[PDB]
């Protein structure tokens, strides 16, 4: 399908052009779930501590690691920075702790999982009397350089951002004193949000970008009937019949022709599988070009609880 498994990141490494996500997925199901996509050819994980299943994909990790199925050097696991650990002194132990939680003595990729920072404790989601989400005073270049600390001490071999809109990700390429550049941008993308102007930036800045929610979050809490349908899309499903794929490899296979990562998530073994062979096929240049023209800015995660914090990151166009 003329498709390398696995694209070159700016810190030298090479990262898996597909992984398995893991947002939403039960933590008794995603022990199994992370198993059978070793199993059957994922190298690489998106993880994350807010999504408090950090624990139960490490047993997987760590069982496959075990059994030889696959060496630590293959693997290539993703977690993220959340937001209430922006503060300098915070970064490490919310790094240990998911380093300690997966098993792992490094990750091949941190994020700084939003722009947001919000005040410390044991809410993800501090809201005040009113229901705002209570902001900490940390900027995103103290937070940045906090990261690149991680990878001097050994702890990640990359860091990267997410959610960061191009202005963003500007200000911390134009960091006074700036040591390591974002690796990976990891943004929504798909094809109602298909991200043109963000993705150029990225890329001609020499930053990857991995592209999340790729078929919709059809399992997001906040779906609603209106809400359109990539997976129901008649459009996008005569394109799939066309090729004798499904419509969810379709979707896979979308953003990898467009030299971006991209992270699919589910606990279904046989979807787990399936949304894997994406590799003998090819979308021709006018597929690519009809499914970029369903583009309707409609985001899945808007983060609507946080637009007025300052660093919000979606107001600007992209
Ligand atoms: N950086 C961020 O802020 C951010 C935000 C959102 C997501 N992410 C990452 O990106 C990952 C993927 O995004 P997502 O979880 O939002 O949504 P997604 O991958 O677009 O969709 C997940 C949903 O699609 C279903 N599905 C998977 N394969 C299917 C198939 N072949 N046919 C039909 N349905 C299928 C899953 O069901 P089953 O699981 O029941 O099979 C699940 O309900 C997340 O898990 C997370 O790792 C990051
Ligand atoms: C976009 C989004 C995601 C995906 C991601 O960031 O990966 C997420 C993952 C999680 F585990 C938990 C929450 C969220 C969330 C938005 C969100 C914001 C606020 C609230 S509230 C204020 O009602 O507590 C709930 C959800």
Same mark, same amino acid.
């Given at each position: 399908?003329?498709?390398? =498994?696995?694209?070159?990141?700016?810190?030298?490494?090479?990262?898996?052009?597909?992984?398995?996500?893991?947002?939403?997925?039960?933590?008794? %199901?995603?022990?199994?779930?992370?198993?059978?996509?070793?199993?059957?050819?994922?190298?690489?994980?998106?993880?994350?501590?807010?999504?408090?299943?950090?624990?139960?994909?490490?047993?997987?990790?760590?069982?496959?690691?075990?059994? %030889?199925?696959?060496?630590?050097?293959?693997?290539?696991?993703?977690?993220?920075?959340?937001?209430?650990?922006?503060?300098?002194?915070?970064?490490?132990?919310?790094?240990?702790?998911?380093?300690?939680?997966?098993?792992?003595?490094?990750?091949?990729?941190?994020? +700084?999982?939003?722009?947001?920072?919000?005040?410390?404790?044991?809410?993800? &989601?501090?809201?005040?009397?009113?229901?705002?989400?209570?902001?900490?005073?940390?900027?995103?270049?103290?937070?940045?350089?906090?990261?690149?600390?991680?990878?001097?001490?050994?702890?990640?071999?990359?860091?990267?951002? =997410?959610?960061?809109?191009?202005?963003?990700?500007?200000? +911390?390429?134009?960091?006074?004193?700036?040591?390591?550049?974002?690796?990976?941008?990891?943004?929504?993308?798909?094809?109602?949000?298909?991200?043109?102007?963000? +993705?150029?930036?990225?890329?001609?800045?020499?930053?990857?970008?991995?592209?999340?929610?790729?078929?919709?979050?059809?399992?997001?809490?906040?779906?609603?009937?209106?809400?359109?349908?990539?997976?129901?899309?008649?459009?996008?499903?005569?394109?799939?019949?066309?090729?004798?794929?499904?419509?969810?490899?379709?979707?896979?296979?979308?953003?990898? %022709?467009?030299?971006?990562?991209? +992270?699919?998530?589910?606990?279904?073994?046989?979807?787990?599988?399936?949304?894997?062979?994406? &590799?003998?096929?090819?979308?021709?240049? %006018?597929?690519?070009?009809?499914?970029?023209?369903?583009?309707?800015?409609?985001?899945?995660?808007?983060?609507?609880?946080?637009?007025?914090?300052?660093?919000?990151?979606?107001?600007?166009?992209?």
């Amino acid at each position: 399908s003329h498709m390398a =498994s696995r694209l070159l990141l700016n810190n030298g490494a090479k990262m898996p052009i597909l992984g398995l996500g893991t947002w939403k997925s039960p933590p008794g %199901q995603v022990t199994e779930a992370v198993k059978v996509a070793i199993d059957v050819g994922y190298r690489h994980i998106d993880c994350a501590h807010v999504y408090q299943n950090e624990n139960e994909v490490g047993v997987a990790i760590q069982e496959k690691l075990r059994e %030889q199925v696959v060496k630590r050097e293959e693997l290539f696991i993703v977690s993220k920075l959340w937001c209430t650990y922006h503060e300098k002194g915070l970064v490490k132990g919310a790094c240990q702790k998911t380093l300690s939680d997966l098993k792992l003595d490094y990750l091949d990729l941190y994020l +700084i999982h939003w722009p947001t920072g919000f005040k410390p404790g044991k809410e993800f &989601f501090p809201l005040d009397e009113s229901g705002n989400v209570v902001p900490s005073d940390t900027n995103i270049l103290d937070t940045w350089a906090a990261m690149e600390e991680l990878v001097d001490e050994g702890l990640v071999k990359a860091i990267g951002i =997410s959610n960061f809109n191009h202005l963003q990700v500007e200000m +911390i390429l134009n960091k006074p004193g700036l040591k390591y550049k974002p690796a990976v941008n990891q943004i929504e993308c798909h094809p109602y949000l298909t991200q043109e102007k963000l +993705i150029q930036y990225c890329q001609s800045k020499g930053i990857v970008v991995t592209a999340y929610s790729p078929l919709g979050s059809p399992d997001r809490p906040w779906a609603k009937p209106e809400d359109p349908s990539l997976l129901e899309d008649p459009r996008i499903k005569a394109i799939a019949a066309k090729h004798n794929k499904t419509t969810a490899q379709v979707l896979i296979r979308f953003p990898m %022709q467009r030299n971006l990562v991209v +992270i699919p998530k589910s606990v279904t073994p046989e979807r787990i599988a399936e949304n894997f062979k994406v &590799f003998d096929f090819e979308l021709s240049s %006018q597929d690519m070009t009809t499914l970029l023209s369903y583009n309707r800015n409609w985001r899945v995660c808007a983060l609507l609880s946080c637009t007025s914090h300052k660093d919000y990151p979606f107001h600007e166009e992209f």
